[PDB]
UniProtKB/Swiss-Prot annotation, chain A:
The last Arg residue of the ACP-binding site is essential for the weak association between ACP/AcpP and FabH. Pfam families: ACP_syn_III, ACP_syn_III_C. Belongs to the thiolase-like superfamily. FabH family. The gene is fabH. GO terms for cellular component: cytoplasm. Its main location: cytoplasm. This is Mycobacterial beta-ketoacyl-[acyl-carrier-protein] synthase III. It comes from Mycobacterium tuberculosis (strain CDC 1551 / Oshkosh).
Length: 329, 332
């Protein structure tokens, strides 16, 4: 059986982001909840979040982000060989969103599939995209994070009601002059699968329509407990596998899960004080799979981070799964 | 002046073993013909299905997957301590999150390993197999678990004379790892998102959740469209697999199309022109269409029945939902 290969040096050629129009203030979700506006900010670091419209979906937003990621890479849908969509909010057990976003982009026949890790979907997808390109299975791909979580949020669960938002962001991954994506370091803890979860599976609900509705529930104390003592290490491994020292990373894009925890990680990771740190979480909240892509994109528009900058990506979330890697913006 | 390290390791990889798990309950054509006036015999004729398996109420895509992996793992004489990652392919994990992967991994005594859920419609296995193969060659892992699981029973409309007799539950998994010589050829895949509705869930969960009093969702299948698609175009992709694998049609010993429909596969066997003695997966007869777990299961059956021996050169062609396909040539 033959063996093929592709460019051994791949890298992020661009980032396209799409953030819904509707801005949701805490007061807005603080109408049915008595969780003090200011408290949420100081606790999580969030001020506002974006919510998609009713006619939008994880998919529509996905294809839009790609349109932009495409334009920014100065590329055509004709240039993409495959697309990977990471999401946890495509409300169809089948068909997947990938082929639809593909046909929707014009590259209707290209290979593709949906990737579903926790909120750490992106890291896994970017890693797989690079793995497929080096294998000679594609040259240029799209990797998109999208989530329309608002519909899954219970306005009365004061512990997850202000954490999630909707949004999308894509990246174009292709051959590159010098490695622009380091080895993937990921993992999990399914023993704590319940940390972040949907409480009632759709089938149980369908055979009990009259009963309760399903909503995402988040056990912060545990998720953040795990993140605090686990992510710093996964972080060092990621840098260690990329061949870098904690002092060499210029931008740090951890999962926009909680500002305070991200800060703790900054110390533990031992990065330079002047290292730019994604804080997009402030006016976008937690977008699970789309978090990091949007975090990067936010850093670039402001110029806070510049193309070429050395970045450390660290995603963590539901099911209790994480994915981290070093890359160039 | 920054040098970001390149990683790699193990060019040669292959199927170390297969492990299947098919539910206990045998549902016959006559059973579903309790709510449908369709012709019994007509079912076996138009599809080639005699019976299918339905998992229990206390079973899930996740529970079946781990059972399969245990077997897949046993059969390779390995332990979770030997696996670096696991990929779960399915379309029937009724939870928007968490993914089934870490869960099933914990369930095997390897809670820390990497893993994710990948959905590519009925052809998720071929994609999942490719990814696992690409990750290993890339040094991101040395050995892996790829599991196909489907519990479609809960999604079938007993009164749908169009699909009611097609879908079924099950799970099969393979242990992917280093091998003496290439056991998994290059991955050929693609899709037709234009026919995204060919096979699908008629109503999304959020829309149903907002109107519980109204219509519950169900899987729907536009028979003709799928037939037309798969029956005439998978022969061409099968050729691409073999060509990419650097092999001749007359070299494949076992053909394993997605057990979607007899008539469709019988046409591909013809379009492919394989040695008359070439063995073809007919596992559909007593398991039906188990989507993502289809080809992996069909492999277990061929292997356990002796119809195919370890080492045979087989062509796998997955096709289905979203209208996506994934094929590759491997050694059993």
């Amino acid at each position: 059986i033959a063996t093929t290969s592709g460019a051994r040096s791949v890298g992020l050629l661009s980032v396209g982001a799409y953030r819904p129009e509707r801005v949701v203030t805490n007061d807005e979700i603080c109408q049915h909840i008595d969780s003090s506006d200011e408290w949420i900010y100081t606790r999580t670091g969030i001020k506002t979040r974006r919510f998609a419209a009713d006619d939008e979906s994880a998919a529509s937003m996905a294809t839009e982000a790609c349109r932009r990621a495409l334009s920014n890479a100065g590329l055509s849908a004709a240039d993409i060989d495959g697309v990977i969509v990471t999401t946890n909010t495509h409300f169809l057990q089948t068909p997947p969103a990938a082929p639809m976003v593909a046909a929707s982009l014009g590259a209707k026949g290209i290979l593709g599939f949906d990737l579903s890790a926790g909120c750490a979907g992106f890291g896994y997808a970017l890693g797989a995209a690079a793995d497929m390109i080096r294998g000679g299975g594609a040259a240029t791909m799209l990797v998109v994070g999208t989530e329309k979580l608002s519909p899954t949020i219970d306005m009365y669960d004061r512990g997850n009601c202000f954490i999630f938002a909707d949004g999308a962001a894509a990246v174009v991954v292709g051959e590159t002059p010098f490695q622009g994506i380091g080895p993937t370091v990921a993992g999990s803890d399914g023993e704590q699968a319940d940390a972040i979860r949907q409480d009632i599976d759709w089938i149980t609900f369908a055979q009990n329509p009259s009963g309760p509705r399903p909503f995402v529930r988040l056990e912060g104390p545990a998720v953040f407990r795990w993140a605090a003592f686990k992510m710093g290490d996964v972080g060092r491994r990621a840098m260690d596998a990329a061949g870098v020292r904690p002092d060499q990373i210029d931008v740090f894009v951890p999962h926009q899960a909680n500002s305070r925890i991200n800060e703790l990680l900054v110390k533990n990771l031992q990065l330079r004080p002047d290292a730019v740190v994604a804080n997009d979480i402030e006016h976008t909240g937690n977008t699970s799979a789309a978090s990091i892509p949007l975090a990067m994109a936010e850093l670039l528009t402001t110029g806070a981070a510049k193309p070429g900058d050395l970045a450390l990506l660290i995603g963590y979330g539901a099911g209790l799964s994480y994915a981290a890697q070093v890359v160039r913006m």
